[PDB]
Amino acid sequence: AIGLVGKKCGMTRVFTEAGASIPVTVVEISANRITQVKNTDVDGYQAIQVTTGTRRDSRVTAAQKGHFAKAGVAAGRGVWEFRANDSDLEGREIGGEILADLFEQGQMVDVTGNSKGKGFQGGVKRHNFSMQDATHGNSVSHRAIGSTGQNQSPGKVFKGKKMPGQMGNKRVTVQGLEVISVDVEKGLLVIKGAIPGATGGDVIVRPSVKA
Amino acid sequence: LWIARINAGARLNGLSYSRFINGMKKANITIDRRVLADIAMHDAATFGALVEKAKAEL
Amino acid sequence: RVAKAPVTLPNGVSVTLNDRQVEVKGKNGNLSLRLHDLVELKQEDDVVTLSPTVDSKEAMMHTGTIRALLNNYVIGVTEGFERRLQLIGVGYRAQATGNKVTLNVGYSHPVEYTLPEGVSAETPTQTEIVLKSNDKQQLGQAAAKIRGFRPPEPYKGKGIRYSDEHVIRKEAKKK
Amino acid sequence: MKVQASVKKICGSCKVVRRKGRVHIICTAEPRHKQRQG
Amino acid sequence: MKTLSAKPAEVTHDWFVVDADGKTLGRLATQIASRLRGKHKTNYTPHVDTGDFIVVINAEKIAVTGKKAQDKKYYRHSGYPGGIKETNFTKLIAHKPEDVLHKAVKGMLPKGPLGYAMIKKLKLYAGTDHPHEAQQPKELDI
RNA sequence: UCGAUGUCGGCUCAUCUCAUCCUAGGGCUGAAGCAGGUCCUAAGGGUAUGGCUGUUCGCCAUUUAAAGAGGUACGCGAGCUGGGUUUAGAACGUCGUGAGACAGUUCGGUCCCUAUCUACCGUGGGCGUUGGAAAUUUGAGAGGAUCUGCUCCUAGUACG
RNA sequence: AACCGCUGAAAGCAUCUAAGCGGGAAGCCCACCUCAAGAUUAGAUUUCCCUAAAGAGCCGUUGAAGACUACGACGUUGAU
């Protein structure tokens, strides 16, 4: 259940011989360098910590530089953890490499990403509220929230009431996407589907939990 | 407050408040609860002696 | 009555109570049960007597069931228990192979049932199941579980029935 | 079954049985005589 | 002569161990609550915490009478509409076994800042071991 | 409550109950099968669009697995509407000598408030977390989500 | 849960129940997704640093980040 961190490069299509277009997105996959192995004895849980990408030394702090030098890996742009188990931690030792061959063609994966940020949005866009009458005497409440509760009883707005607020720029997982192709030498993962975020954003690809 | 402190002092010596006060009234001891609580708090051996008198009266 | 009845042990059986755990041994095998803490077990010459500890209705009721279970254990570790099932229906057939039985009753799939440890099935013919067990409770549970896959039906009698069970017969199209 | 406030025997094959504090009528002869109190 | 208070700096809190194995929940909780409040001390003053530190082991082996294991219900509200959750005594003791005795004692303590202070001294552990051998708690049957 | 607690209906947005409309599990059946009926369990989700009328309702058309019954100031006008009712104009029928009147009708007829506090939706600042710091995290707990048709096949078999 | 049991006494029988052992629902608790240590019980792990350090911020160039913020990137050892 360990995965890998990549970069969304954008979407294209893959044509099949039968003449079907498959919408795909391409994930750039620099090698995921193992910076730490966590275990039941020392940490209480089993996980693999990896770094990917690159960071310049002026932007790597002394604490992080010591943490990377302990593993013997070059500092990446970020550090990510993957919940593992005894079978997952089999041959994964500190300083090792995770390449795109962790995934095979045709296999289901889950992709987690940071959604595209819409900023402050009203109920109509954020919660699919119905608009109110464009005409017919409606005064100034075309995109208004409408009623927010009841009368004297309960005399409050309930928690979790759908309202305006920030929308997007959140962690989103799309489940059950298919791996279309894998290229370790090119560092390239082609996945059927949409994959949260904008191109350039960090994405996490993990073997699917539904399967 | 005095009754609470007297109850604690008597239970340290093996008696409850409602038996200790009865034992005092049977022994004809007129010490008030304010003074008894003061003795229980600040003089444990004297309060032990008072408990002994009450317990001999029962 | 039941509790006062003494359990008569044949020459092979040997019940050995040890700290609220009666172990009955015999030729057929070994069975065990927990002695309720309201019951005393006393063993005499080829006879076991159950008694209530403190005389009360509750203790009497509990020693009655201890006595019944012990008697079942003795008779099943000396002779065993046997239940029989019949499969009424044209395409209904059962096949016992080892500790598992495969029933083809009426479904789009055969039903495979694995017997509990303690019960053993065999099919002389293909519409009769014979279960033999060391104890009555597990024999009955296995029989009831096999029967529950396709219980007898009133309109034609089809299904898995016991050997000595009478099935109520309803009439289709009574006007 | 019949779930009612009044459960009694409707024939000589009916039986009154209590389980879990609840009164049942179980009949070996007539399955529509099966009753539960409630 | 005046009635004096216990002067928090002069109070000492002693450490005791209670084995909860097979004891009645409420009857043990009353004694723990009294000890935590400091009612057994003759310097007891209601605004001062004069209680002891109670360490409780075998907290999962506390007993309830009747059918209370299956029938005593613990509710909570989450703050969201319809958000009333219910657990059982048996399931609570399976899930977070120290919660049962913690709840019993918390209901029996004063409901204020000094009550919050004095329940801090309750140390509950499911199982036979506790980590406070450095405090040398003495065994207290209660 | 009259030194003012804005009516009906719609719109928007709800929230709870279960006496359950669908879906789920059951007993009985005057349950052959398919369909049902009745009752028990069950509130997780789901539970139409139109024509008419201000309607709520109701009738009807066409669907749907179903088109639930209710509570929430007959939920919701400091969120919207303003068609009905309930000002001042006018007319008809009716009553009254008349001024006028009518849970009779008819045509027309100003809907304010920049949100302090609680609540709620988001998003920050402070301090704390037994020296400080850069990261990675466990999860006590909380929320979301929970629907369902049809076709094929088993099999035109079981049943008739 | 309803419901259906197995064995079984009270109550020589019977009996799902009193002891004991089963089956069983879109419901409950997990499992999935998101948040989550102000969980003041404030948890854990790895590194770094302590005669102003390790770092953080101000400032600047900014961003599919954004009301302001915050968050992300970069500042000549540089493609912000």
DSSP chain C: -TTTSPEEP-SS-EEEE-SS-EEEE-SS-EEEEPPPTTEEEEEETTEEEEEESS-SHHHHHHHHHHHHHHHHHHHHHHT-EEEEEEEESTT-EEEEETTEEEEESSSSS-EEEEPPBTEEEE-SSSSEEEEEESSHHHHHHHHHHHHHTS---TTT--EEEESSPPPP---S---
Distances, alpha carbon A58 to alpha carbons A67, A68, A75, A78, in Å: 16, 15, 11, 15
| Crossing angle for the helix pair B44-56 and B17-27, to the nearest 10 degrees | 70
Given B7, B34, B44, which is nearest E3 (Cβ)? B34
Cis preceding-peptide flag for C124 (omega within 30 of 0): no
Nearest by Cα to C135 from C30, C46, C63: C30
> Strands D2-4 and D35-37: what pairing?
parallel
Which DSSP helix (H) or strand (E) runs through A166? strand A165-167
> Which residue of chain A has the CA closest to E78?
A159
| d(CA C98, C1' F156) / Å | 37
Would you state the structure tokens that stand for residue E25, as one six-digit string?
């929940």
CA E67 to chain centre: 23
Phi, psi of C114 (to 5 degrees): -95, 125
Phi, psi of C57 (to 5 degrees): -60, -40
Say whether B41 and E40 touch across the interface (CB within 8 A): no
Q: Are chains E and A in touch, 3+ Cβ pairs below 8 Å?
A: yes
Instruction: Give the span between the Cα atoms of E21 and E15, in whole angstroms.
Output: 19
CB atoms within 10 A of CB A190: 19
A159 in contact with chain E, both atoms CB, cutoff 8 A: yes
Chain B residue numbers with beta carbons less than 8 Å from the beta carbon of E37 are none
Chain B residue numbers with beta carbons less than 8 Å from the beta carbon of E41 are 8
Listed as ranges, the nucleotides of chain G within 7 A of a protein C-beta are: 2-23, 28-29, 32-35, 41, 44-49, 54-56, 64-67, 73-79
Chain E residue numbers with beta carbons less than 8 Å from the beta carbon of A158 are 80-81
Residue with tokens 């209670």: E18
Instruction: Give the span between the Cα atoms of E44 and B37, in whole angstroms.
Output: 10
Structure-solving method = cryo-EM
Instruction: Give the span between the Cα atoms of C18 and C26, in whole angstroms.
Output: 17
Would you state the structure tokens that stand for residue E87, as one six-digit string?
């657990």
Resolution (A): 2.6
Q: Residues of E numbered 76-95 whose beta carbons fall under 8 angstroms of chain A's beta carbons: which are they?
A: 79-81
| d(CA A151, C1' F74) / Å | 13
SS3 annotation, A106-117: CCEEEEEEECCC
Distances, alpha carbon C1 to alpha carbons A153, C41, C67, C68, D29, in Å: 66, 16, 10, 11, 29
Phi, psi of E133 (to 5 degrees): -65, -20
Task: Report chain C's C-alpha Rg in angstroms.
Answer: 20
Nearest by Cα to A10 from A195, A165, A171: A195
Strand arrangement, sheet containing C7-8: C7-8, C47-52, C39-44
D14: left (phi over 0), alpha (psi -120 to 50) or beta: beta
Neighbouring chains of C at 3+ CB pairs within 8 Å? none
Query: B20-58 burial, b if ≥16 CB within 10 A, otherwise e?
Result: bbebbeeeeeeeeeeebbbbbbeeeeebbebbeebbebe
What is the distance in angstroms between the CA of the first residue and the CA of the last residue of chain C?
Answer: 52
